[PDB]
Amino acid sequence: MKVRPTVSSSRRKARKAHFSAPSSVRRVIMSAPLSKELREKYNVRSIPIRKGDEVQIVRGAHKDKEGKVTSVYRLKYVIHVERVTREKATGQTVPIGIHPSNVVITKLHLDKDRENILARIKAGREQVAKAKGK
Amino acid sequence: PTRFSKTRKHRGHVSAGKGRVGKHRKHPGGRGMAGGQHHHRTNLDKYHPGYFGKVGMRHFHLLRNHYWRPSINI
Amino acid sequence: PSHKTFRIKQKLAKAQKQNRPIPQWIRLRTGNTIRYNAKRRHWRKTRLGL
Amino acid sequence: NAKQRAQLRLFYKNKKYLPLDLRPKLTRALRRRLSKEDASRVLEKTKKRLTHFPQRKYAVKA
Amino acid sequence: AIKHNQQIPNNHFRKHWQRRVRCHFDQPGKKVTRRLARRAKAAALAPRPVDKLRPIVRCPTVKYNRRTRLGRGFTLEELKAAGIPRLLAPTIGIAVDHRRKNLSEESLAANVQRLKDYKARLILFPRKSNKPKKADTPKDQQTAETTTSLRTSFGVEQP
Amino acid sequence: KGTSSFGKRHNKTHGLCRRCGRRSLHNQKKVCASCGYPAAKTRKYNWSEKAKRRKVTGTGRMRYLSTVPRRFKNGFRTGVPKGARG
RNA sequence: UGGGCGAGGCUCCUUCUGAGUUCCCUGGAACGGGACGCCACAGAGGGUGAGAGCCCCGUAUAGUUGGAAGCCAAGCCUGUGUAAAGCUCCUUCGACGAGUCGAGUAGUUUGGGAAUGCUGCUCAAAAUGGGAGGUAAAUUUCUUCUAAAGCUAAAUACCGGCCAGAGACCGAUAGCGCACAAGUAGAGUGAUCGAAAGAUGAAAAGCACUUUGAAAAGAGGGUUAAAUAGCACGUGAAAUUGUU
RNA sequence: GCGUGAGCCCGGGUCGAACGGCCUCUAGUGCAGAUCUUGGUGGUAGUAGCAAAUACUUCAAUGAGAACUUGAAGGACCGAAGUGGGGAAAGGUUCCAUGUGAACAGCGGUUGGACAUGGGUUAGUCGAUCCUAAGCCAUAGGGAAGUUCCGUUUCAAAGGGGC
RNA sequence: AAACUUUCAACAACGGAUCUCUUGGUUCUGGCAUCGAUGAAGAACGCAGCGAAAUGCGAUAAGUAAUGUGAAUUGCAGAAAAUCAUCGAAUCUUUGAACGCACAUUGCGCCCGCCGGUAUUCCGGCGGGCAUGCCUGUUCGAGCGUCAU
Numbered sequence A: 001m002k003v004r005p006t007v008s009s010s011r012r013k014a015r016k017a018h019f020s021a022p023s024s025v026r027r028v029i030m031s032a033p034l035s036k037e038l039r040e041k042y043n044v045r046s047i048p049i050r051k052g053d054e055v056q057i058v059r060g061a062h063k064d065k066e067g068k069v070t071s072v073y074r075l076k077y078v079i080h081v082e083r084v085t086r087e088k089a090t091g092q093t094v095p096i097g098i099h100p101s102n103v104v105i106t107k108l109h110l111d112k113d114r115e116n117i118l119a120r121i122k123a124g125r126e127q128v129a130k131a132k133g134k
Numbered sequence B: 001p002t003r004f005s006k007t008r009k010h011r012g013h014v015s016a017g018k019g020r021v022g023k024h025r026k027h028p029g030g031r032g033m034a035g036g037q038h039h040h041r042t043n044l045d046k047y048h049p050g051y052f053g054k055v056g057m058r059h060f061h062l063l064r065n066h067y068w069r070p071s072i073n074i
Numbered sequence C: 001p002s003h004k005t006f007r008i009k010q011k012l013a014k015a016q017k018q019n020r021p022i023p024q025w026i027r028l029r030t031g032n033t034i035r036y037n038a039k040r041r042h043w044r045k046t047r048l049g050l
Numbered sequence D: 001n002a003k004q005r006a007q008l009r010l011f012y013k014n015k016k017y018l019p020l021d022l023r024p025k026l027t028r029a030l031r032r033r034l035s036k037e038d039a040s041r042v043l044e045k046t047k048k049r050l051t052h053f054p055q056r057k058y059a060v061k062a
Numbered sequence E: 001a002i003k004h005n006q007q008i009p010n011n012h013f014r015k016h017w018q019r020r021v022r023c024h025f026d027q028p029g030k031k032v033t034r035r036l037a038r039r040a041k042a043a044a045l046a047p048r049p050v051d052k053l054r055p056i057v058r059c060p061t062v063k064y065n066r067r068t069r070l071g072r073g074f075t076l077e078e079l080k081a082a083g084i085p086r087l088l089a090p091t092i093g094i095a096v097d098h099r100r101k102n103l104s105e106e107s108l109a110a111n112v113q114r115l116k117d118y119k120a121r122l123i124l125f126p127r128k129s130n131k132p133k134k135a136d137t138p139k140d141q142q143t144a145e146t147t148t149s150l151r152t153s154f155g156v157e158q159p
Numbered sequence F: 001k002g003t004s005s006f007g008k009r010h011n012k013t014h015g016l017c018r019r020c021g022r023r024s025l026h027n028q029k030k031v032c033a034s035c036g037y038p039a040a041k042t043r044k045y046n047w048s049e050k051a052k053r054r055k056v057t058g059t060g061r062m063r064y065l066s067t068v069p070r071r072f073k074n075g076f077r078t079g080v081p082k083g084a085r086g
Numbered sequence G: 001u002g003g004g005c006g007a008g009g010c011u012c013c014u015u016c017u018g019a020g021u022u023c024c025c026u027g028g029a030a031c032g033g034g035a036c037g038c039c040a041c042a043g044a045g046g047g048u049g050a051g052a053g054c055c056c057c058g059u060a061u062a063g064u065u066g067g068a069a070g071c072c073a074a075g076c077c078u079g080u081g082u083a084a085a086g087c088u089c090c091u092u093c094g095a096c097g098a099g100u101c102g103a104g105u106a107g108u109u110u111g112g113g114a115a116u117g118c119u120g121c122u123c124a125a126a127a128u129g130g131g132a133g134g135u136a137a138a139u140u141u142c143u144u145c146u147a148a149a150g151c152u153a154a155a156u157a158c159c160g161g162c163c164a165g166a167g168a169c170c171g172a173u174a175g176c177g178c179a180c181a182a183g184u185a186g187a188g189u190g191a192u193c194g195a196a197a198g199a200u201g202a203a204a205a206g207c208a209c210u211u212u213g214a215a216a217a218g219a220g221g222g223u224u225a226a227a228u229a230g231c232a233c234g235u236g237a238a239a240u241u242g243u244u
Numbered sequence H: 001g002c003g004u005g006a007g008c009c010c011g012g013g014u015c016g017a018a019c020g021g022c023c024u025c026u027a028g029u030g031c032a033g034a035u036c037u038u039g040g041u042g043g044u045a046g047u048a049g050c051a052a053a054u055a056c057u058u059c060a061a062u063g064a065g066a067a068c069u070u071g072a073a074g075g076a077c078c079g080a081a082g083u084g085g086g087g088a089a090a091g092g093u094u095c096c097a098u099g100u101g102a103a104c105a106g107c108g109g110u111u112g113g114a115c116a117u118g119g120g121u122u123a124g125u126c127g128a129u130c131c132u133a134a135g136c137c138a139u140a141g142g143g144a145a146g147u148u149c150c151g152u153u154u155c156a157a158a159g160g161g162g163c
Numbered sequence I: 001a002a003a004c005u006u007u008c009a010a011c012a013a014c015g016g017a018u019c020u021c022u023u024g025g026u027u028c029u030g031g032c033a034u035c036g037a038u039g040a041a042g043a044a045c046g047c048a049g050c051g052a053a054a055u056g057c058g059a060u061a062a063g064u065a066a067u068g069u070g071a072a073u074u075g076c077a078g079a080a081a082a083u084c085a086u087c088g089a090a091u092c093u094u095u096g097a098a099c100g101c102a103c104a105u106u107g108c109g110c111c112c113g114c115c116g117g118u119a120u121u122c123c124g125g126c127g128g129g130c131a132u133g134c135c136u137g138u139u140c141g142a143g144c145g146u147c148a149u
């Protein structure tokens, strides 16, 4: 249950914020879990998804399909996975939009920025665990 | 509560208990105490004898605290 | 008339430039709801007030 | 423009009057209200009794 | 139009009363705001009580003649008899009323005794800690159980 | 009167106002029927709440007034973030 | 009696946050059902292909990473009585607001009644004087203040402005006129007047191709869980109409 | 199927995401009327009608389709106070070229002032601009609680020529 | 007997009710005090690779600087972030209380300075200025209003 006066449990406000969030907020909204191996390696549970990540689909009709994230369409709150596609009437191939929360990240695109992120998350989680274990 | 009122029982009955001949018009007889010395004189004389007129003298700027003396019996 | 002021000529220019159908690629955008130009004006239908 | 304005601010440093575009734009009312020192000025009569009888720090035991 | 045995109606709603209706849906919120303001001002007056010392006063009329209550402030005569300087009284939590007079020795003596008890219970911190003066509490009796509500600790004992 | 008289309608009582832009500037009186130009004060009446709200503040761009709340929130500060190029 | 520090605390910005996507069935898709687990100072809310605490954002808690320095502040360090300031007593003195008060009259206003305030005109003061003391007047007392100059937080009004949180409210003829390129389209010379109008599907996957037709389209065929969901799109009543 | 009844329940079809029973609480709670409001739809009814301005015809081309497109020929009208050639007000792109499904042109339409895509307005000499008219608005002043009214040379210290 | 009319039923039409939904209203509560001659509110006209409108912006024009985040935007094209957040530096057309005089005119002037045309005088280009009421001060003045030599 919410307590803080700054937090609001209004369904209307929550939906408005979600569906009119700017691109930077949509980045955080479109987070995906890490695989078990990456989670053990980095002590990080979830991260915002990025183009060039390798993911495995764990929900929907395309379960168990793996591939590289080729586009993160924030405007449509979906991602595009390599070879996870569909055919139009003309036979032309179009990507299928997958929500990032329906996939798991099996391999991460890592550059100092993507990593300062992981170090911050790991340090925060470790500190919180230590403080709770005091 | 509205569900206990007689208007709910009057639904389906034209004139809502106000009659067909007399029709619940706006203000027959006048507003408030109109016609006290006239068409309403019969009521104002049967009840409230002494409604009209002056009796007694005036006290400008009466301060009620001057007359404070509550009484108790033995 | 042939005699025009610059202000009147400029406003006629603006009306002429606004008198057009909507671009076709607009209707292909995600979340689009514009079907047609709803503010279209014709010289025989609606008189512009100068 | 930024370089020119920085140079102009350096030039007009420690000068009594500087151009309006270089003057700070807070608000009309903010620019018109009394300065801090003028608003805090007090009479000598007030200052004497403020010196000799200020609000004290005190406690009252139960 | 009266129709039966009714009390004669005199409801003053012949103006546009709906234009000036004052509801009070903000009563609990206003109470919360008042409590917050009280807490803030008590914190600001950190060791001091949140109010000023008031004198005992007899209500004016022949009604309420029998009851006493709190007044506005102590008179100059009361302060002089208690030995508290006029300019020093309002700076140590004592309310001063320059326009009230002591027409009776009873009220004068009661208020003087009240002031003397307050002065006996007063703890006066020095203006500068490193050089206390002779009129300040000398740092040893400066620790005691204090009161922050003079309206309760110095109320009307028997109105 | 009627149809035949409507054919003589080829003049203009009102032209475009420079202040409000409406075609309400009386060409002979040279006074705007909407905004009251050229009077200094904008014409506004309390018996037309609709007319008041059609041109009250907020119905236009608010080129300058929309930036005031942010400057107030930050305290009408000046200068640059400690550590800024330039 | 002047100056300067000031631990420490409260602020502010910023980093960070627990737990299943385990097995079986239905389904296009589990977020449904069944089984077995976990977290909970978090089972508020929202999204995700159907009712998700553990898929994601957030949610609880005081903390913490780094930073700016806004406030308060225990206590310290240090000037100094020429000057200035308070108190205790006192013979004496003791300035105090003028076309103002007040009076008459007129108008208005008030609960204010032989006149409550205000204003116009006329008269026009005094020095224990003056005002008031809710019945007009003369006389004699008493009580209470001290007008005709001025400043001043708070408790009070207000949802107009900017933010925020809510509801036994309304649910597209309702709720603001406006859930939409709405004070818009449009009307009027003008002041002004002023609408209608939300919903395919999880995803356009928005029907390739063949055939008939001048074309619009039709018939096959295709997509979809579904096309009698085909942009005249959720459901699809009645009035009214066609065929059987 | 139940109930005297308002109604309640079930079977079948359609459909696609929420909903109901019981006891209390609550109300913007029950429609045939109000020349009721908004919206939709009928009979009338393929009906009234589409009849002022003298009028059309032949061949050919185009086209799916031609009385009202075009070419040629014929027959006619307006008959210089024109159905002619140019302007003022007013309109604003209707002007020109190309193309054209639907809608509009109360019949049709291959045509169009329609729709779509592109073009088009060249000034020392023509106008505005300059002048003053009826008149309007300032100023100095004077009214008005004031929005503002009078005032236009008036009870004003109101300017331009040279070395 | 058909047709026609009517009644009943199935299917198909017409129409948009019903159900369910809701980035919207409405009402209450809490916090805050910040427009403008340093040119506001409002109006006009423009600005995108492909836009008419809405939104945003002002010839630095669907925006520039700066800070933070950290890889998009997306209808197509393109390229090597962003239609991102924040926002303290700037730009900010014609107007508008609107200010050289006007304005139903993109009208007509004057002053200073620079650059050209033979140029203090005319023409052209560029930049900066020229409203009113009032206050303080400055300077130049008027008056037998008045004072001494």
Ligand SMILES: [Mg+2]
Residues within 6 Å of the ligand: B013
């Ligand atoms: Mg009956």
Ligand SMILES: [Mg+2]
Residues within 6 Å of the ligand: B015, B019, B020, B023
């Ligand atoms: Mg009746």
Ligand SMILES: [Mg+2]
Residues within 6 Å of the ligand: B021
């Ligand atoms: Mg009768």
Ligand SMILES: [Mg+2]
Residues within 6 Å of the ligand: B022, B023, B024
């Ligand atoms: Mg009756």
Ligand SMILES: [Mg+2]
Residues within 6 Å of the ligand: none
């Ligand atoms: Mg009324």
Ligand SMILES: [Mg+2]
Residues within 6 Å of the ligand: F008
């Ligand atoms: Mg005429």
Ligand SMILES: [Mg+2]
Residues within 6 Å of the ligand: F038
């Ligand atoms: Mg003017």
Ligand SMILES: [Mg+2]
Residues within 6 Å of the ligand: F059, F060
């Ligand atoms: Mg506008």
Ligand SMILES: [Mg+2]
Residues within 6 Å of the ligand: none
């Ligand atoms: Mg979490």
Ligand SMILES: [Mg+2]
Residues within 6 Å of the ligand: none
């Ligand atoms: Mg299955």
Ligand SMILES: [Mg+2]
Residues within 6 Å of the ligand: none
């Ligand atoms: Mg859901």
Ligand SMILES: [Mg+2]
Residues within 6 Å of the ligand: none
């Ligand atoms: Mg399950």
Ligand SMILES: [Mg+2]
Residues within 6 Å of the ligand: G052
């Ligand atoms: Mg959930």
Ligand SMILES: [Mg+2]
Residues within 6 Å of the ligand: G097
């Ligand atoms: Mg006085």
Ligand SMILES: [Mg+2]
Residues within 6 Å of the ligand: none
């Ligand atoms: Mg008087």
Ligand SMILES: [Mg+2]
Residues within 6 Å of the ligand: none
């Ligand atoms: Mg009097």
